[PDB]
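Quick question: what would this complex look like in 3D?
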Amino acid sequence: EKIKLEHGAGGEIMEELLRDVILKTLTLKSAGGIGLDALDDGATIPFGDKHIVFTIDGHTVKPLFFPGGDIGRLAVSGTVNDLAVMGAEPIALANSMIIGEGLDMEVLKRVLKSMDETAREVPVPIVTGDTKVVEDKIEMFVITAGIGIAEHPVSDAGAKVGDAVLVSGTIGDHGIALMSHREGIAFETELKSDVAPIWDVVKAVAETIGWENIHAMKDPTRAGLSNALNEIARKSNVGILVREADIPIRPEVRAASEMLGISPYDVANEGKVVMVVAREYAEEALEAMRKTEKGRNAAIIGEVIADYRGKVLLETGIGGKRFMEPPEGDPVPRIC
Amino acid sequence: EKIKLEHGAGGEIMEELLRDVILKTLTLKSAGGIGLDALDDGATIPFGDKHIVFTIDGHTVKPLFFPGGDIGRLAVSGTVNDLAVMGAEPIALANSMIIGEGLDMEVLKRVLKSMDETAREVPVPIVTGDTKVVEDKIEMFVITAGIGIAEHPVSDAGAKVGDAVLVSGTIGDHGIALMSHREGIAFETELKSDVAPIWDVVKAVAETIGWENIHAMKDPTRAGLSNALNEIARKSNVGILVREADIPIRPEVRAASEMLGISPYDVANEGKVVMVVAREYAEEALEAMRKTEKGRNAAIIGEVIADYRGKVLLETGIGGKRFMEPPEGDPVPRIC
Ligand SMILES: Nc1ncnc2c1ncn2[C@@H]1O[C@H](COP(=O)(O)O)[C@@H](O)[C@H]1O
Ligand SMILES: Nc1ncnc2c1ncn2[C@@H]1O[C@H](COP(=O)(O)O)[C@@H](O)[C@H]1O
Ligand SMILES: [Mg+2]
Ligand SMILES: [Mg+2]
């Protein structure tokens, strides 16, 4: 048996590798809180009356620079966002770079400048790192780890019947922008990735409704909104019912996805959060998001239900329903 | 200007890249304690009456499996050792893997099993991670980040005049074993790498003499003992005088290094610590190390002096001296 691209594509095939190989081989997997077996956006460690949150993400996107961002902005944003969806204020990043021999020094400078600018938006410092140079023709991979502090960690398994399901903005932007750029599809301007740190959106909600009323979150990166909703449903052992008409999609992203023959629900987002909140605070949560710049297009898209446990239903027309199936993997190669 | 292999070789050429490009481009570099500008083995963050210590290391060693270890054992050991030389008890690791499409699943299983076994020696859990699969023919890169807790962080800049300089064991084992394996040099058995987690050696000393009497430590990985001593001298603004005869070198490593035409002082070690301790506790520190299995061959090799600030002197014969020059880089390609 050989490793396939699908094993790193963030969908069901990767999930099989994680459960059958990684989780079964590693034995020490928790430091006292959320650990590897939870397969959440990060891990947690009790520390005093708070929790340290710990995450890591590798980035192998091609091309390194794309409309709306680059591998540097992606590296900072992805790690900040993984901490944010665990309920953690980011406190430090670590930056590993693996660089192909012969890369232009100016490329490395541009990547670092983008990391710096993106980190300053949070704000969060890059406090340690590592650099390796290899003969392989890879251009550059960037791997960032993050530490945050959470007073009240939020899992992807805490959804309750009756809760509202929100997204902080338009869906499909990153994956579709990257595929569109590769295919030469563009409108009045090129479609831009949404890549950005969204700790401010999560914090805004928590400051309004309290951490206890945010029941679950996921960062809908690899394999998209569909993967994220399916994971929350499965891990929380609940059903999720979403109204297709209420899911925000940028008009240009809708058009490009049709041309590409790919669903915007199935591709990576890099500046969005999926959030599940107590029914009675759903409108307060939505208003808090829409007050921020990065959450300006937020919407309530669904609700958690008692039946169809572990499944996600899409409602269309005047009430008809079908399953929103978990992707086998992200249909976009080298997307992040 | 292009990125060269030397830029990742852990010596003076890498130091130039760090100071002229990375440190000058990144602006947010500290979370309140030791930060990026210190260029130490890790960073520190005040937390209550203790300090969180944070480190990251990428591993691109070839071949993946070598005498005495593999990339999995290297990934766990290197990160644990970086935390240990900051004075930190390891509490959690994060595991990023980037895998070449087509790698045998059995190779991935073997690597993970080695990580598991090595982590269990510490003991320290692997609590989060990431997997990417790329088309590039890289086999596998492993990037690990670590979190530890230190009551009293130890810098590489705290050496004082009169202090003793110790190493926890034989010097040059890893780099020379890897080069010997590539060249087909072997004795009754193949030379083994020393790769191993050495938190127990550091802890043993601290439990004996107290953290306050350990003034500096470095993990002598890339560019070897020579690089580590030069960095401590330069950052502490002191001279270091070492007696060549007192530096422990395995007889087989000495022989192989001669055949290879490479100094054992200039190549990576993966199971060793360089430690600088208060003069009056040097013998207690040495005894504490030699009581452990991994520190069994520890030696006092030198002392910190007031002149030749920023330099390292090697004493030979009956008193003659020359400089131990900082390497331009590790003379071993793809060593870690
Ligand atoms: N190579 C790996 N080692 C350990 N844990 C992993 C690895 N790859 C993924 N994970 C975990 O699997 C889940 C999904 O990974 P990600 O694709 O980073 O969201 C997260 O909980 C990760 O911590
Ligand atoms: N790409 C990078 N980004 C940020 N810091 C780095 C990078 N590479 C190395 N460093 C820092 O430079 C020092 C030496 O790196 P290392 O070779 O990992 O010992 C350490 O303090 C690292 O944290
Ligand atoms: Mg995530
Ligand atoms: Mg180090």
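Answer marked as accepted. Chain B touches chain A through 81 residues (CB under 8 Å).
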